[PDB]
């Protein structure tokens, strides 16, 4: 199920970038709504999500 986990991580990162925390203020550079983050396209976000996976960047939301 390792393959599925990898997909889930990428999916979470993609949605986080295209969604974010919804809050205007965010301390996460790689998170939507974050002043330091700029809106990206579906393709652009996909690339960022893939890159984030490689670095295993932490998500804005807390872990389960």
């Amino acid at each position: 199920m390792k393959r599925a986990a990898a997909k889930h991580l990428i999916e979470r990162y993609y949605h986080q970038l295209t969604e974010g925390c919804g809050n205007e203020a965010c301390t996460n550079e790689f998170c939507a709504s974050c002043p330091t983050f700029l809106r990206m396209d579906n393709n652009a976000a996909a690339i960022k999500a893939l890159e984030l996976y490689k670095i295993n960047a932490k998500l804005c939301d807390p872990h389960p």
């Binding site: 390792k2 393959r3 990898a6 997909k7 990428i10 999916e11 396209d41 393709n43 996909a46 999500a49």
Partner: protein, 73 residues
């Protein structure tokens, strides 16, 4: 060591590799499907193709080398 309080929380390790050996980067097919699965993302997209090209280049370094005209002069 439970017997010794000092030992506990000290010099204690819990390695958990094994499955960690599996590398996603070693499965481009799976990665491609992931990108395609994402909404608004298609394999026909230039951005997707460009990303794979760059990643592939970094993953593997070309060993090609000129056999002549080494000195441009």
């Amino acid at each position: 060591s439970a017997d010794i309080d000092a030992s506990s929380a000290m010099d204690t390790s819990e390695p958990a590799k094994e499955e960690d050996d599996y590398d996603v980067m070693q499965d481009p097919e799976f990665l491609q499907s992931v990108l395609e699965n994402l909404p608004g993302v298609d394999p026909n997209n230039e951005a997707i193709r460009n990303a794979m090209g760059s990643l592939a280049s970094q993953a593997t370094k070309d060993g090609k080398k000129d056999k002549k005209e080494e000195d441009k002069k």
